[PDB]
């Protein structure tokens, strides 16, 4: 099985450097050219640099040029890419791929992708969320907004409402900081009788909140 | 330094026979003569052409049979 694993994406703040890392198993990775893909969040793919087997040459889409640095250790069967003075538009999952063949004529296709690791470039520092309710079949729910970075948990009852529960994903706002909903569709019968609560958690910032959510 | 006169005998002829192979780019293990597929800088500015797109000059440095006054004088070639 040929294999490829990334590691040391994360977030960093716009002007400074991040370095990604991906290691080859089950070829010859000295007998193949390299590449990075990216794709932004919820966007295609773009094909960003190309290394050749020996190491010595490189090229780079015009959108990342002077800014990526591809690079690779034959000895480690090691791909590196290498990002430097980084615009919030470079944000994206960076894929490494296996050249399919055609380095040399100019004919780039990857038949071998690595899971791809997140690069996050934002100047917002850490934050817990405000959670306010959406109060009331009917629905009900919660808003947890402005926190920093991805992600946050959200359970109901603390695990015990699972059906009819929708998390949506994410959203960037203006201000950098991500705000995310949560809801449940419920008997209307019920909306006296039974306590609707929604856990939030924030690893990143360590905070847990619990919310009541009644009309 | 100044040339005298040729050594004569069937001691005083020597022939070095090889082949130069050429050096074009090399842009990957199976395309040994061939460079890596041109590609044009948009502007004189930024051109900068990697090595396996260049090719280069072959040169080889024959060693001929030692002399110590004598030297080698290359007289024909094919």
């Known amino acids: 099985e040929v294999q490829l694993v990334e590691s040391g994406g994360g977030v960093v703040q716009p002007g400074r450097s991040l370095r990604l890392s991906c290691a080859a198993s089950?070829?010859?990775?000295?007998?193949?050219?390299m590449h990075w893909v990216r794709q932004a969040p919820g966007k295609g793919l773009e094909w960003v640099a190309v290394?050749?087997?020996?190491?010595?040459?490189?090229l780079y889409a015009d959108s990342v040029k002077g800014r990526l640095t591809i690079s690779r250790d034959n000895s480690k069967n090691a791909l590196y890419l290498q990002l430097n003075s980084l615009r919030t538009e470079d944000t994206a999952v960076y894929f490494c791929?296996?050249?399919?063949?055609?380095?040399?004529?100019?004919?780039?296709?990857?038949?071998?992708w690595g899971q791809g690791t997140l690069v996050t470039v934002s100047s917002a520092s850490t934050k817990g969320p405000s959670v306010f309710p959406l109060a009331p079949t009917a629905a009900l729910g919660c808003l947890v907004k402005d926190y920093f970075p991805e992600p946050v948990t959200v359970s109901w009852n603390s695990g015990a409402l699972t059906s009819g529960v929708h998390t949506f994903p994410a959203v960037l706002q203006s201000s950098g900081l991500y705000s995310l909903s949560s809801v449940v569709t419920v008997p209307s019968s019920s909306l006296g009788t039974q306590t609707y609560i929604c856990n939030v958690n924030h690893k990143p910032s360590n905070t847990k909140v619990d919310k009541k959510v009644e009309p | 330094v100044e040339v005298l006169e040729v050594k004569t005998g069937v001691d005083s002829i020597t022939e070095v026979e090889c082949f130069l192979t050429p050096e074009m780019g090399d842009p990957d293990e199976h395309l040994r003569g061939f460079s890596k597929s041109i590609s044009i800088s948009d502007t004189f500015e930024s051109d900068s052409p990697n090595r396996d797109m260049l090719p280069c000059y072959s040169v080889a440095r024959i060693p001929l049979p030692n002399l110590n006054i004598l030297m080698w004088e290359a007289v024909t070639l094919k």
């Open positions: 089950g070829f010859t990775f000295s007998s193949s050219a």
């Open positions: 791929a296996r050249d399919g063949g055609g380095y040399s004529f100019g004919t780039y296709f990857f038949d071998f």
């Open positions: 290394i050749s087997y020996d190491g010595n040459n490189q």
